[PDB]
Amino acid sequence: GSHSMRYFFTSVSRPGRGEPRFIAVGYVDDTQFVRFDSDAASQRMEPRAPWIEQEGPEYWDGETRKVKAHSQTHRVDLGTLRGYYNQSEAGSHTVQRMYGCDVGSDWRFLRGYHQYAYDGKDYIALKEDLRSWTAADMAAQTTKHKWEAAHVAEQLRAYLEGTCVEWLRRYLENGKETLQRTDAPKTHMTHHAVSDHEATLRCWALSFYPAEITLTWQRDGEDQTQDTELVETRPAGDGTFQKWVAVVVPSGQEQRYTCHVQHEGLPKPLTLRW
């Protein structure tokens, strides 16, 4: 199947005194592997997955230096953006950056991305061709002109097609025992009665990896969406994921309803009944 490496960065200004809170996290697919927190004692990029510890002291020195550069750009950014938007010094503001690369089943480059937000809103993003920019407003258009003069897209494209792809390939090999393994959802169903005429059926999927999954109800073999509740896919905390979907049914008619699970760890779609 396909794979990705993605980095996420949040900086939140602290008006009264000092520099912003900066948090960086790195992912391969749904596995977090590195972190940096400016409020932490070490002031180093830290491992969050056993397989990244394979990497030597040069790696960690290099990543630390780069993540600190990221942090300084963000600090500069908060001040510039405050200027662009004519805002006071009194309020706390936020910048968010995400970037990374996708590869298909053959592990070849599929797409790359680099997007940026200010106070939760689209600011500027690299386009799919990795050659041009999407600026949301006139502040972002000023940045686009600046990044065009300086050929920023060209530098990002090289990373996204090269290093990004090359180091994801490297990470997938080193962590193959977990990263290249699929864990099938463990499924069951529960029953509840609200009154002597109405019942709830809940279909559970547990302990699955990767996070992507589809859970749906059918009634007499037709898709049923009305009277269903589908929760957001949630982390178990051991690296696996969980999700459920529920349907409300007339008591006694439970047998008409089937739950259907699709997941990349299941060669065939699974079906459950009460």
Binding site: E63, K66, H70, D77, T80, Y123, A150, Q155, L156, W167
Partner: peptide
């Protein structure tokens, strides 16, 4: 492996 450089806005 992080991008070598990050341009400011």
């Amino acid at each position: 492996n992080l991008v070598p450089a990050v341009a400011t806005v």
